[PDB]
Every structure is written in structure tokens, then in C-alpha cells.
Amino acid sequence: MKTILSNQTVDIPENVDITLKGRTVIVKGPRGTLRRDFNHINVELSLLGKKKKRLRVDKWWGNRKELATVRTICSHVQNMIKGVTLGFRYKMRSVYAHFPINVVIQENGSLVEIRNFLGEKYIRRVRMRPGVACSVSQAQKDELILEGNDIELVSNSAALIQQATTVKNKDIRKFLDGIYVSEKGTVQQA
Amino acid sequence: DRATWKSNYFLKIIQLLDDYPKCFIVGADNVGSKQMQQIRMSLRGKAVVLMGKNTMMRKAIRGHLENNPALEKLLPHIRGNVGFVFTKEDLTEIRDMLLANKVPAAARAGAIAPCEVTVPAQNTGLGPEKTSFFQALGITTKISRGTIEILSDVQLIKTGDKVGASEATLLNMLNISPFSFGLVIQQVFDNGSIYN
Amino acid sequence: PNEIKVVYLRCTGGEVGATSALAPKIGPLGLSPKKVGDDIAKATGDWKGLRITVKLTIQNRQAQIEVVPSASALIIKALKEITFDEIVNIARQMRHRSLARELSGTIKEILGTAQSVGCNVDGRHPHDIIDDINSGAVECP
Amino acid sequence: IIEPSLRQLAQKYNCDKMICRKCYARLHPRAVNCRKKKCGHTNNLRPKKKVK
RNA sequence: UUGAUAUAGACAGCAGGACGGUGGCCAUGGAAGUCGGAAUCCGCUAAGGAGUGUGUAACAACUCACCUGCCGAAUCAACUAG
Ligand SMILES: [Mg+2]
Numbered sequence: 001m002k003t004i005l006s007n008q009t010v011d012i013p014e015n016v017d018i019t020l021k022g023r024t025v026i027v028k029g030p031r032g033t034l035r036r037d038f039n040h041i042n043v044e045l046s047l048l049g050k051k052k053k054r055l056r057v058d059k060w061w062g063n064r065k066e067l068a069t070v071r072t073i074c075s076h077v078q079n080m081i082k083g084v085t086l087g088f089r090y091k092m093r094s095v096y097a098h099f100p101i102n103v104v105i106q107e108n109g110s111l112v113e114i115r116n117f118l119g120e121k122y123i124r125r126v127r128m129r130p131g132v133a134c135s136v137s138q139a140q141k142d143e144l145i146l147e148g149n150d151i152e153l154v155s156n157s158a159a160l161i162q163q164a165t166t167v168k169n170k171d172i173r174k175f176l177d178g179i180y181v182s183e184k185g186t187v188q189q190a
Numbered sequence: 191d192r193a194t195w196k197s198n199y200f201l202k203i204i205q206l207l208d209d210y211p212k213c214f215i216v217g218a219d220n221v222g223s224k225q226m227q228q229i230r231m232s233l234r235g236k237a238v239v240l241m242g243k244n245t246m247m248r249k250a251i252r253g254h255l256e257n258n259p260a261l262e263k264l265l266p267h268i269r270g271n272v273g274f275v276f277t278k279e280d281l282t283e284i285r286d287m288l289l290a291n292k293v294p295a296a297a298r299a300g301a302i303a304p305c306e307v308t309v310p311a312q313n314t315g316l317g318p319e320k321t322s323f324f325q326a327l328g329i330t331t332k333i334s335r336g337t338i339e340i341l342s343d344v345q346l347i348k349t350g351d352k353v354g355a356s357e358a359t360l361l362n363m364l365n366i367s368p369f370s371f372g373l374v375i376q377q378v379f380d381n382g383s384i385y386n
Numbered sequence: 387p388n389e390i391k392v393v394y395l396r397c398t399g400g401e402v403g404a405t406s407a408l409a410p411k412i413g414p415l416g417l418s419p420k421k422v423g424d425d426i427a428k429a430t431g432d433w434k435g436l437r438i439t440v441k442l443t444i445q446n447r448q449a450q451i452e453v454v455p456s457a458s459a460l461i462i463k464a465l466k467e468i469t470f471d472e473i474v475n476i477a478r479q480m481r482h483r484s485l486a487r488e489l490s491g492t493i494k495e496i497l498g499t500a501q502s503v504g505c506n507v508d509g510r511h512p513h514d515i516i517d518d519i520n521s522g523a524v525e526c527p
Numbered sequence: 528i529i530e531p532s533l534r535q536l537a538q539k540y541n542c543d544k545m546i547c548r549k550c551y552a553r554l555h556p557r558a559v560n561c562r563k564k565k566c567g568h569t570n571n572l573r574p575k576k577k578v579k
Numbered sequence: 580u581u582g583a584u585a586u587a588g589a590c591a592g593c594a595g596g597a598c599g600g601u602g603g604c605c606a607u608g609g610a611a612g613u614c615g616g617a618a619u620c621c622g623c624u625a626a627g628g629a630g631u632g633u634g635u636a637a638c639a640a641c642u643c644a645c646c647u648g649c650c651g652a653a654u655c656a657a658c659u660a661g
Pocket residue numbers: 075
């Protein structure tokens with residue numbers, strides 16, 4: 001069944017203006033600049049108003065399989081705009097049973113190494129995505145704080161840490177040590 | 191059955207409001223059912239508590255009260271969890287007895303706290319086998335006369351924070367009342383009168 | 387607080403048993419009764435009921451008052467040997483009579499159908515009377 | 528010796544998950560059908576066994 | 580296709596209540612709503628099954644079915660054969 005048209009819009013705040021280059025959306029938020037293309041999805045991106053900065057996405061005879069991408073595009077932009085006026089922050093607790101997990105932040109938070117995982121002599125160096133920098137939290141004992149503008153880079157960087165510290169050849173129901181996100185918050189709390 | 195249930199609910203409020211002209215809007219807060227059966231047991235000889243769906247009572251008072259207006263003051267009003275108490279006696283005396291009869295409900299795990307309570311220093315007197323929980327909460331305790339004694343006073347819980355499971359249990363074991371509330375009255379309807 | 391509180395109830399009654407009673411298992415909770423506490427608690431609570439007879443035991447620094455919390459079931463099976471219409475009514479009036487009741491018509495049918503396994507007057511089961519509750523609808527007040 | 532809330536945090540990722548009864552895949556606790564192709568996306572699901 | 584719900588406000592999420600006799604009776608060693616046998620009532624109701632599951636020796640503490648709050652327009656189930 002081909003629908004006539006499915007469309008949904010988002011409302012862009014004043015502090016960031018959005019520029020459209022074909023299917024590439026560019027935001028100019030205060031925290032920086034993030035650019036993303038959408039050429040793999042055939043849609044209609046159009047800026048609506050010069051007073052409230054509305055962006056509209058259409059589908060125009062899409063089946064229910066490609067009806068879902070309309071909200072996905074908007075959600076990507078909504079996370080995209082939120083990431084450049086608010087930022088992202090995924091607090092990462094470090095749970096361990098017997099061996100204390102020793103992590104030291106390398107240059108500019110661009111490299112991090114997990115040293116004493118489960119008492120291994122191996123050193124786990126993991127590189128997070130460019131533009132994402134980690135930081136040891138100061139409020140409480142052991143939790144990594146990483147910031148960024150794009151949700152995918154911050155999340156994928158966070159996932160890199162979570163998968164790197166994993167238990168092999170043992171029950172994972174016990175041996176619950178590792179590094180896992182505690183909450184996926186933001187910055188400026190605004 | 192559902193069609194039967196609603197209609198007899200409609201005539202239930204209609205006949206009783208035509209029988210009872212004065213009413214309260216009572217905040218149906220996080221109130222256990224054991225208190226609700228008790229609050230009417232203390233009210234059995236005086237009044238009755240009655241509530242329902244917020245639009246259930248609403249369409250009842252717009253759909254069947256064009257015969258006697260001036261009860262439409264509540265039409266804005268019924269929002270959120272509400273309740274109707276129905277006495278034929280005075281206002282203030284029935285006002286305070288519902289307020290005074292408050293049951294010290296426990297601190298459910300996952301509920302925000304509006305009150306700040308801090309334990310004083312004392313020997314609780316329970317068995318010296320629950321000492322492990324105190325270590326989890328951070329307080330150090332020692333055995334005096336074969337019972338658990340807290341050395342010093344530390345902060346327990348502030349307002350507007352998430353409670354912890356072990357703390358929730360330990361608060362109940364000490365038999366010390368947490369933040370607690372019952373039925374709270376917002377404002378009053380007394381034959382077309384509005385009063386807080 | 388009352389100089390002793392061993393409030394904790396017990397779900398054994400009727401025949402003495404003595405050894406078959408669970409007093410040694412619950413005795414170390416208050417340290418007062420022990421074996422003899424069961425003996426002194428049972429002698430007064432031997433009969434009425436002669437059944438499971440869950441009892442509330444308020445201590446007396448060594449002794450107890452074996453107040454039986456008047457559940458519907460414990461007395462109706464015991465009084466069964468059939469009408470018992472006034473018998474269930476008087477058994478109903480002796481209880482705490484809270485039942486979250488509003489009127490007497492409320493409480494009569496509460497104790498009425500409570501013995502769906504314990505029958506009712508003559509040749510009928512405690513439910514058809516509950517429909518047309520008219521006999522004694524105001525008799526107790 | 529882990530604080531229980533941290534344990535529950537770990538249990539969210541390691542223990543509290545669904546397992547497909549045909550292909551033993553690891554699924555989120557709200558899964559209704561297996562996400563894998565090799566079993567045909569069955570609804571035959573069982574929870575991951577706890578260490579209790 | 581059949582059926583069901585819905586501005587007398589569905590559905591899904593987010594949050595509350597989830598009871599008195601009664602820790603109902605026969606089971607007992609402990610089963611208290613939830614190892615087993617029968618029942619199904621009352622009141623209050625907003626609903627609460629003298630109990631859908633986790634579980635405790637049991638308790639208990641949760642979850643459920645059932646109602647209520649926020650949310651305001653359609654939604655759900657069982658089948659069928661391409
Ligand atoms: Mg989303």
C-alpha cells in the first residue's frame with residue numbers, strides 16, 4: 001500500500017541555524033558544527049519558516065518499509081541539534097570484584113588504557129572516535145566521563161570501552177566486573 | 191458488564207450529589223488501600239469517600255446537571271488523582287479529621303521524598319546479625335550489650351531524592367517512620383462556595 | 387512496652403499434642419514459653435475450637451492469654467455437628483465485627499458465604515440465601 | 528564486594544537478558560521474537576537463567 | 580475474515596492503589612494469595628483474584644488482573660493464504 005504522503009517536522013531553536021545541501025544537513029550550534037548527509041534515503045528536506053526555523057521531511061509514495069525512515073531522519077536531526085546546543089555525556093561506572101580497575105587518561109582524552117582488568121598483565125589500549133574525549137570523574141570514585149557533539153561517535157566510543165573489558169572463559173553471570181555506561185546524559189544540563 | 195458498571199456509576203453519583211450538596215476535592219495521593227478502608231472506617235458514621243476516573247465524574251456533572259447549574263465550578267478543577275468526600279456536617283471539623291488521621295506509610299522503593307529525616311543516636315536493640323547492612327550504608331556500628339548500636343549521627347535522606355533498597359529495608363527494620371502522607375484535601379465545594 | 391510482647395500468633399489448637407506442637411521452633415523468639423509455655427497455653431485453649439484454631443497469644447511474663455482471633459472458618463467448622471442460623475449470627479456478633487462493613491446486611495452475608503464448604507441452614511448452600519437477604523436484615527441493631 | 532546498585536547495573540548487561548530457545552541468542556529482556564535469521568525469528572523464548 | 584476496545588477517553592509508555600474476615604478451611608513440618616484438595620463470599624469500592632508470576636522453610640518484599648492519574652486519536656486480538 002503506497003501512502004499519498006507521510007511527513008513530520010521538528011522545531012529548531014534560535015541559537016542554531018540549519019543549512020541544507022541537497023540531503024546533507026549542517027547545524028551551526030554554539031558548541032561547534034556537525035554535518036551529516038542523507039543521500040542513502042530518498043526524501044524531501046525543506047526549511048519552512050524564517051521566524052521559527054522549521055524543517056519538514058516528506059516521503060511521497062513510500063511503502064511501510066520506507067515509511068519508517070521519516071521519523072528516523074528527524075530523530076537523527078533531533079539528536080544532531082541537541083548534541084550541538086547541549087552536548088552529550090555518558091557517565092561510565094567501573095565495577096570490579098577483587099582486582100581494582102586502573103584506568104589512566106592519555107593525551108587529550110583521545111587514548112585510554114585499562115591496566116588492571118581482572119588481574120591480567122595485558123594492557124588494553126582503546127582509541128575513541130575523533131572529537132570524543134574522555135575524562136576521569138571527580139565527583140565519585142571510579143567513573144569515566146566522555147563528551148562530544150555527535151551521539152554516534154560518543155556512543156560508539158562508549159561501546160568500545162564496554163566491549164574491551166569483558167570476561168572470557170568464565171561465567172559472566174558471576175565475575176560481573178567490567179566497564180558499562182551508567183546513564184546517557186548531556187552537558188550544561190540546560 | 192462494563193455497560194452495567196458505568197451506568198450504575200452514573201446514577202450513583204447523580205442521586206448522591208442530589209442527596210449530598212457539599213463536597214471536598216481530596217487528593218488521592220500515594221495512599222495504600224489498607225488506609226482507604228481504614229479512612230472510611232473512621233468515617234463510617236459520618237461520611238463516605240468516593241472517586242473514580244477524572245472524566246467519569248466529569249461527564250456525570252456535565253451530562254446530568256443542566257437541571258441545576260452552579261456545580262460547574264469544578265469543571266476546570268478535576269485534574270489528576272482526585273477524590274470526593276461527602277458529609278452533611280460542618281466544614282472545618284470534617285476538614286481536620288481527614289487531615290489529622292494520617293497513617294505513617296513506609297518509604298516505597300522508587301518514590302520521591304518530600305521530607306528530610308535524620309536518625310538520632312541510640313541503641314536500636316535488634317539482633318547483632320544485621321550489621322552487614324550498616325556497613326553497606328557506610329555507618330560503622332559496634333555491639334553493646336549484644337545489640338546493634340550506632341556510634342554517631344550521619345545523614346539519612348534529603349528531600350527529592352531516590353531511595354535505596356537496603357536503606358528502604360533498614361528504615362523499616364528500625365521501626366522509624368519515614369516521610370509519610372495520607373489523603374490531603376485541596377479545596378472545598380459547599381453549595382457553590384470555593385474555599386481552600 | 388506492656389513489660390512483655392510475644393504477640394506472635396500460633397496456628398495450632400484443639401488436641402494438645404505437646405510434642406507435635408511447634409513451640410520449640412518458635413520458642414527462641416521470646417525465650418519465655420519453652421515447653422511449659424506450650425503446656426500452659428494449650429490447657430486454656432484446648433477446646434473451642436477443637437481444630438487448627440489459630441490463636442493470638444499475649445504474654446504474661448511467663449503465662450499467656452490465648453485469645454483466638456475470630457476468623458469465620460475456625461468457629462463454623464467447629465460448631466458444625468443443619469441450621470445454625472442464630473448460631474452463625476451470634477458467632478458473627480461476638481467477633482471484632484470490623485470487616486470494613488457499612489451496615490448489618492453487609493456483615494451477615496460476609497459470614498454467610500464464608501462457609502461455602504461448610505453448608506448452611508437445612509437443605510441449602512450459603513449463596514441462594516445471600517441473594518434475597520431479607521430475614522433479619524436489621525435484626526442485630 | 529560490589530555495591531548492590533553497581534551489581535544491578537552489571538546485571539542489566541550480563542544477566543537480565545532473553546535467550547532464544549532455538550539458537551541461544553542473547554536478546555534484550557523485552558524481546559518477543561529472536562532477531563537472528565538462522566532460527567527464523569522464533570517467538571520460542573526463555574529468560575536467561577539466574578545464579579540464585 | 581471474524582471479533583474486541585475507544586472523547587462516558589482507548590492502546591502503548593511514565594506513576595499510584597493492588598485490601599478486612601483471612602496468616603480463609605483440608606492439607607503442616609512451612610506454606611500466609613501463589614508445593615498440593617475443594618471451593619469464588621462479603622464490604623469497601625478505584626480495583627484487589629479469599630490470587631497471574633519472582634520468591635521466602637515460612638514470612639516478607641516485589642510483579643501480575645483490576646482500577647486511577649499524565650498523555651488526547653484511533654487501537655487491539657485470534658485466524659487466514661500470497
Ligand atoms: Mg527516540
